Amino acid sequence: ARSVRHIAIPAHRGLITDRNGEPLAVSTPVTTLWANPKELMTAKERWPQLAAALGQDTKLFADRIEQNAEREFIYLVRGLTPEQGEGVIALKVPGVYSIEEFRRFYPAGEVVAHAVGFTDVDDRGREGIELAFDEWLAGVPGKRQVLKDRRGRVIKDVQVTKNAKPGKTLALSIDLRLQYLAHRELRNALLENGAKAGSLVIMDVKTGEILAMTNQPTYNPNNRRNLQPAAMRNRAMIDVFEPGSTVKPFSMSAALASGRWKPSDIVDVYPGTLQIGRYTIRDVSRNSRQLDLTGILIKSSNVGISKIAFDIGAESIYSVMQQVGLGQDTGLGFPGERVGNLPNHRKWPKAETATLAYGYGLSVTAIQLAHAYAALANDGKSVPLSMTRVDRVPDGVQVISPEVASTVQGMLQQVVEAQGGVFRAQVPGYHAAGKSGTARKVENAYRSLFAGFAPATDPRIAMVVVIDEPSKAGYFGGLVSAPVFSKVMAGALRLMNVPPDNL
């Protein structure tokens, strides 16, 4: 008998870089050694020396080969360097053959780990960008017909196909400089507050581009041996959570659009509680009677935003939240990326109306929350999300009216820059705007939130900062996540050369 096998000619996997061409995932040539057990069996004397080369026990190596004595192909090792393979080749062991394979390295390392992801042993993507663009990155391999006599001799070897086409280069939306800023400051904030986890997303409000996406804890994907389950969670995309106060600005956008509310209008929130059946809504700050709409956001009055929700109805508040992407399919097409839940009750009762209004009644991801604020900074027009670079920007959906959007922008600039506002969130040199949040997890654990965008006069980037159960200080968003927002934004804006607008 003869043996007719088909053997693939590997395709150089497409380079991944950041938006500016800095290398993030590079396929470098390496050597994988393979053996023919039929040929190995005729030179047993050479086995132990080869076991030493592979760093394996002499007996086990011998046991493994004998067991596979009928087979014609087995792996010895995969992905040794060229010099590394030459040392094992120079033993001149009968039955030992080699091929040039490609293996993936990641020069940015842990700073972009969850975003970029990584590949299998076969050089196919199994996480992050590597997976969701695998077809783009893989290329089309070649094919060889190798004819052999069952003994160890090539009779015919011919390429029965076009030459292996390399994969396509992929520039991400991510700017590595911004990512590195995000990365370190999130990390700094965790140590400062003794928090167990965190996420920080940066978005380009005009282009739909994810300029940064960093999670904590992280991992070096180059060394994936002692991997903890929690370190590999892409939290920005997979940790769903109730946004709480951070969606109050969308409740207000539905109020302003109803035709029944202006910013100067007033709601009585005395005495900081609200009986609804047996359920009792409560504000944290209970030194208020009449607050205007900016006041409701500054004080973060759950009572105020519930009363407004009773006036206009839930249907309208839901509509704005659904259109801005909250609890909705994101489109990026990522592996196991969470969608959340924005229930559509159709006709809401009292309690549900309130709960949804102050953000307890839904669950979202950090990416969704960022995308939502991007629309609000973008004069109410949502431009589709993108993890890859967007040279030709796709036309965006106007989801909130331009004048309602401009009003709510002005309100969020007030929450940051007014008296008794979230002053820690201020970004020197620029007019900033945003909203703190503090969600209780259900011995009390808290998520510290802050969404926002800057500069006020012509918004460039939206930013979301999530810090998971801090403990070495306070826990409110205004205290914990506001200063992170401040620093990262202060640096992020200057790295892109955005002109100062507080002049």
SS3 label, residue 355? helix
Is the separation of the CB atoms in 459 and 381 below 8 Å?
A: no
Stated in angstroms to one decimal place, the resolution of this structure is 2.6
Count the Cβ atoms, other than its own, within 10 Å of residue 498.
18
Distance CA 25, CA 132 (A): 14
What architecture does CATH give domain 174-220+418-503? 2-Layer Sandwich (3.30)
SS3 label, residue 477? helix
Eight-state DSSP code of residue 379: T
Is the separation of the CB atoms in 247 and 210 below 8 Å?
A: no
Distance CA 409, CA 398 (A): 16
Token output for 26: 């590079």
Adjacent-strand bridge partners of 463: 202, 452
Distance CA 57, CA 496 (A): 56
Task: Identify whether 271 is preceded by a cis peptide bond (ω within 30 of 0).
Answer: yes
Instruction: Name the CATH topology of 234-417.
Output: Beta-lactamase (3.40.710)
Is the separation of the CB atoms in 398 and 381 below 8 Å?
A: yes
Q: What is the dihedral of CA 496, 426, 384, 139, to 10 degrees?
A: 50
Count the Cβ atoms, other than its own, within 10 Å of residue 342.
19
SS3 label, residue 493? helix
Adjacent-strand bridge partners of 29: 102
Q: State how far the alpha carbon of 92 is from the alpha carbons of 50, 88, 209, in Å.
A: 10, 8, 54
Q: How many residues does the chain have?
A: 503
The domain ranges of the chain are 1-173, 174-220+418-503, 234-417
Adjacent-strand bridge partners of 279: 276
Burial class (CB in 10 A: 0-12, 13-18, 19+), 105: middle
**Closest to 250 (Cα-Cα) out of 385, 394, 361:** 361
Q: Which residues are tagged catalytic? A: 245
SS3 label, residue 387? coil
Residue with tokens 């014609």: 72
Given the DSSP bridges, would you call strands 16-17 and 170-171 parallel, antiparallel or unpaired? parallel
